Design an enzyme around this catalytic site. Structure first.
Site, PDB file in Angstrom:
ATOM      1  N   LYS A 111       0.794  -1.214   0.000  1.00 57.55           N
ATOM      2  CA  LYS A 111       0.000   0.000   0.000  1.00 57.55           C
ATOM      3  C   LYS A 111       0.827   1.265   0.000  1.00 57.55           C
ATOM      4  O   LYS A 111       0.306   2.367   0.151  1.00 57.55           O
ATOM      5  CB  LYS A 111      -0.996  -0.026   1.157  1.00 57.55           C
ATOM      6  CG  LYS A 111      -2.148  -0.996   0.920  1.00 57.55           C
ATOM      7  CD  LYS A 111      -3.350  -0.676   1.768  1.00 57.55           C
ATOM      8  CE  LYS A 111      -4.501  -1.522   1.320  1.00 57.55           C
ATOM      9  NZ  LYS A 111      -5.728  -1.164   2.055  1.00 57.55           N
TER      10      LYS A 111
HETATM   11  C1  1NH Z   1      -4.703   4.879  -2.846  1.00 54.70           C
HETATM   12  C2  1NH Z   1      -5.825   5.701  -2.211  1.00 54.70           C
HETATM   13  C3  1NH Z   1      -6.802   5.082  -1.501  1.00 54.70           C
HETATM   14  C4  1NH Z   1      -6.845   3.572  -1.297  1.00 54.70           C
HETATM   15  O1  1NH Z   1      -6.616   3.211   0.104  1.00 54.70           O
HETATM   16  P1  1NH Z   1      -7.388   1.982   0.712  1.00 54.70           P
HETATM   17  O2  1NH Z   1      -6.578   1.565   1.956  1.00 54.70           O
HETATM   18  O3  1NH Z   1      -7.568   0.843  -0.246  1.00 54.70           O
HETATM   19  O4  1NH Z   1      -8.740   2.514   1.274  1.00 54.70           O
HETATM   20  P2  1NH Z   1     -10.228   2.327   0.843  1.00 54.70           P
HETATM   21  O5  1NH Z   1     -10.683   0.913   0.959  1.00 54.70           O
HETATM   22  O6  1NH Z   1     -11.010   3.286   1.778  1.00 54.70           O
HETATM   23  O7  1NH Z   1     -10.294   2.863  -0.604  1.00 54.70           O
HETATM   24  C5  1NH Z   1      -5.775   7.234  -2.432  1.00 54.70           C
HETATM   25  C6  1NH Z   1      -6.401   8.060  -1.277  1.00 54.70           C
HETATM   26  C7  1NH Z   1      -6.322   9.546  -1.629  1.00 54.70           C
HETATM   27  C8  1NH Z   1      -6.599  10.527  -0.738  1.00 54.70           C
HETATM   28  C9  1NH Z   1      -7.013  10.201   0.672  1.00 54.70           C
HETATM   29  C10 1NH Z   1      -6.505  11.991  -1.127  1.00 54.70           C
HETATM   30  O8  1NH Z   1      -6.124  12.792   0.001  1.00 54.70           O
HETATM   31  C11 1NH Z   1      -5.788  14.153  -0.367  1.00 54.70           C
HETATM   32  C12 1NH Z   1      -4.286  14.299  -0.496  1.00 54.70           C
HETATM   33  C13 1NH Z   1      -3.701  15.479  -0.985  1.00 54.70           C
HETATM   34  C14 1NH Z   1      -2.301  15.553  -1.086  1.00 54.70           C
HETATM   35  C15 1NH Z   1      -1.492  14.455  -0.697  1.00 54.70           C
HETATM   36  C16 1NH Z   1      -2.086  13.276  -0.204  1.00 54.70           C
HETATM   37  C17 1NH Z   1      -1.349  12.058   0.245  1.00 54.70           C
HETATM   38  O9  1NH Z   1      -1.964  11.144   0.802  1.00 54.70           O
HETATM   39  C18 1NH Z   1       0.105  11.927   0.019  1.00 54.70           C
HETATM   40  C19 1NH Z   1       0.781  10.876   0.669  1.00 54.70           C
HETATM   41  C20 1NH Z   1       2.130  10.616   0.394  1.00 54.70           C
HETATM   42  C21 1NH Z   1       2.819  11.419  -0.525  1.00 54.70           C
HETATM   43  C22 1NH Z   1       2.171  12.505  -1.127  1.00 54.70           C
HETATM   44  C23 1NH Z   1       0.820  12.765  -0.850  1.00 54.70           C
HETATM   45  C24 1NH Z   1      -3.478  13.226  -0.110  1.00 54.70           C
END
Ligand code: 1NH
Ligand code: ZN
Lengths: 315, 401
Positions: A111
């Protein structure tokens, strides 16, 4: 010589002679640190040394090996991942051995974004997609909905044109879990990028398949959303038989998905100059109230809006 | 309480007697949530929905200075910890001492790259996520010291270094592309007034390609629709005044279908589990859609409520997402963290405060001390902070180079 970070005989880098020359650069958090992490001795140790080799941009085999430890301590450190790719090209490392490395750490941290981006960079460099569909399938065998795994699969398939067997794979996973929305998404991705949905035979095949799935699991929202998604395109009213055929599951397979799908069909009939407009409208508003007050109250605000909006439009 | 009504028991999953990993996992969650809802009845107490403000506050004010090694996994996301904590305090109406504020400003100064943008910690290469976080933190602080930390010419130059021919943005150099990078860019450039004429050329079109058959938006074109990516895609479009590039109706249908009839909270993507952080990414979309449809002069729009069940959401967050020790979380059984505290709190505020021009209608479940400070649905920092920041940076002209 990879002394495992987990090895019982793992020794701090400072307690290591082949490192002794280089002085460790600690982290400058300032005289008044905030959100300051009380690092462990190991974390702290590897990073002070990472900082040192990076500050001096030392592209050594020893630096290459340390990044691996710094990655294992924090796989989200993109700076370390960056330097590591720098060293992969300088030292001219065997990229196949590196594919073995990244295969292992992705299995451990599936993940994580960095681990997957790194694998992509490796596949691009080697222009070799031969292991991909199989590796990804092993990750999906563990978590069939891993977003990164599905994203990577889509990229390999599109870049290297490996479309031929994906629809079969999709059928496989749908058998495993007909409610896996990532798979319903993959189904649409494959079809829209191969035959398309304008081919009536395909459309027919897809609408029939989806209808059987609804029969089996009437409350599986994914099948419903896919049904709406591939017809909604051309306009649900463009399909006369469908309204009929769904009005039949009314007593049998009559979840609030059927109810909602009917309001969707009506919505489109009103917009496309349907006969019995006064009639059709009252139905759509009846369903909208059954939904808002009884069948789907969590979405009352939506269904009311739908009611209002529908009136405002076809009064 | 909507959740405790007897008729609510009818909302439990109906697996059609066909079990799959999906139905089995959902069932486990509903069972867990049900035990929480019914706890009052089983213990014979009168339900008291109370946001544990003091608990949340000690947790927050403590994490803002130091954290255990459990946080080593966030060593590359420090500006995020500042944003999440400072934003949580802000919603809780807890003010930042001038002394703490300067410390945060000094820290973010160390994270800032000589080549524009911020890194996740002192000395790390810049990346758009911590850049977004750093800039949002600095605006929450809103001092002239904070604002001055941001080197606007190097920032603009940096964004240009990530801009792609197709309209997308890399998250960092030699990095990946997804809808989050566009939002991080549109957010920091608008707030700091560095938007040139061609900076976001083709970005609205690229984001529009991310909307799929579901109505929602995926990380990149072709991907499954997700709550986190959908907020980024739509919020970015609002900033760019291009919301109309999306099929707002199918999106409206998708986001509203993400609220769980039983749990009351939001799920990230269809057929997955509810999670408190989605109280913001998903619910936060409704205020955005309200504004957009109203911009299109939609007559049927409500004059008092967002287009999701505000009551059920507030009930999920309050009964199911607070940790007794302080801090909020994903779902019962999960561990508290600063990310979830920020978003559970952020989504609570969105659920309590409605507004559409001259209309302002609050809905605070539980003890009225539960009312939190409002949050701007695009930037997710206080509305005042947004006006204050944009007004300030508008005193500076857009870097000509
Ligand atoms: C893979 C996924 C979701 C799938 O996850 P899952 O565990 O499968 O959950 P579900 O079952 O709920 O989908 C994507 C989730 C996206 C999100 C929460 C958007 O959040 C806004 C945001 C803005 C800017 C940066 C980020 C970052 O998270 C970030 C992190 C590291 C580096 C750079 C930026 C997020
Ligand atoms: Zn979450």
């Amino acid at each position: 010589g990879f002394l495992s970070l987990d090895s019982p005989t793992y020794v701090l880098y400072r307690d290591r002679a082949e490192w002794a020359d280089i002085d460790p650069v600690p982290q400058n958090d300032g005289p008044s640190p905030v959100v300051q992490i009380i690092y462990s001795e190991k974390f702290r140790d590897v990073y002070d040394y990472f900082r040192a080799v990076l500050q001096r941009d030392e592209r050594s085999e020893r630096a290459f090996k340390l990044t691996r430890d710094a990655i294992e301590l924090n796989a989200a450190n993109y700076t370390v991942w960056h330097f590591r790719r720098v060293l992969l090209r300088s030292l001219q490392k065997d990229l196949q051995e590196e594919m073995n490395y990244i295969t292992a750490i992705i299995e451990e941290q599936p993940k994580n974004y960095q681990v997957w981006h790194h694998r992509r960079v490796l596949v691009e460099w080697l222009k070799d997609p031969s292991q991909e569909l199989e590796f990804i399938a092993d990750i999906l065998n563990q978590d069939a909905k891993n977003y990164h795994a599905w994203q990577h699969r889509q990229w390999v398939i599109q870049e290297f044109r490996l479309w031929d067997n994906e629809l079969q794979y999709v059928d496989q996973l749908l058998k495993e879990d007909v409610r896996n929305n990532s798979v319903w998404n993959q189904r649409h991705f494959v079809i829209s990028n191969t035959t398309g949905y304008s081919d009536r035979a395909v459309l027919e095949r897809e609408v029939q398949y989806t209808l059987e799935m609804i029969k089996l699991v009437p409350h599986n929202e994914s099948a419903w959303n896919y049904l709406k998604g591939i017809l909604q395109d051309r306009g649900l009213s463009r399909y006369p038989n469908l309204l009929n055929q769904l009005l039949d599951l009314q007593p049998s397979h009559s979840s609030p998905y059927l109810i909602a799908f009917l309001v969707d069909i009506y919505e489109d009939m009103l917009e496309n100059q349907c006969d019995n407009k006064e009639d059709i409208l009252n139905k759509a508003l009846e369903l909208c109230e059954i939904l808002a007050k009884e069948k789907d109250t969590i979405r009352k605000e939506y269904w009311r809006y739908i009611g209002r909006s529908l009136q405002s439009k076809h009064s | 309480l909507y959740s405790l009504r007897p008729e609510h028991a009818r909302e439990r999953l109906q697996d059609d007697s066909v079990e799959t990993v999906t139905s089995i996992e959902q069932a486990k969650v509903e069972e867990k949530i049900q035990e929480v809802f019914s706890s009052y009845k089983f213990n014979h107490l009168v339900p008291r929905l109370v946001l544990q403000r003091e608990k949340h506050f000690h947790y927050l004010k403590r994490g803002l200075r130091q954290l255990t090694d459990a946080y080593e996994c966030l060593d590359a996301s420090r500006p995020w910890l500042c944003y999440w904590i400072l934003h949580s305090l802000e919603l809780l109406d807890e003010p930042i001492p001038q002394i703490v504020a300067t410390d945060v400003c000094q820290f973010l100064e160390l994270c800032q790259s000589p080549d524009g943008g911020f890194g996740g910690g002192p000395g790390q290469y810049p990346h758009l996520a911590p850049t977004y976080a750093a800039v949002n933190a600095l605006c929450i602080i809103g001092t002239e010291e904070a604002y001055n930390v941001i080197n606007r010419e190097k920032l603009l130059q940096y964004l240009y270094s990530l801009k792609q021919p197709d309209g997308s943005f890399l998250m960092h150099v030699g990095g990946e592309v997804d809808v989050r990078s566009a939002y991080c860019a549109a957010s920091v450039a608008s707030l700091t007034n560095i938007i040139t004429p061609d900076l976001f050329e083709g970005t609205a079109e690229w984001i529009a390609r991310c909307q799929n058959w579901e109505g929602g938006i995926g990380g990149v074109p072709g991907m499954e629709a997700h709550g986190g990516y959908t907020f980024c895609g739509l919020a970015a479009l609002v900033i760019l005044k291009k919301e109309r590039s999306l099929n707002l109706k199918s999106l409206l249908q998708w986001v509203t279908s993400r609220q769980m009839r039983f749990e009351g909270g939001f799920q990230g993507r269809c057929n997955k589990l509810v999670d408190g952080c989605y109280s913001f990414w998903q619910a936060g979309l409704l205020p955005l859609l309200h504004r957009a449809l109203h911009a299109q002069g939609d007559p049927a729009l409500s004059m008092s409520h967002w287009m999701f069940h505000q009551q059920a959401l507030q009930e999920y967050i309050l009964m199911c997402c607070q940790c007794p020790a302080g801090g909020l979380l994903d779902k019962p059984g999960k561990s508290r963290d600063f990310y979830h505290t920020c978003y559970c709190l952020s989504g609570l505020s969105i659920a309590q405060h409605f507004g559409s021009g001259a209309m302002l209608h609050d809905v605070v479940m539980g003890v009225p001390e539960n009312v939190l400070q409002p949050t701007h649905p695009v930037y997710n920092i206080g509305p005042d902070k947004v006006i204050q920041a944009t007004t300030h940076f508008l005193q500076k002209p857009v870097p000509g180079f």
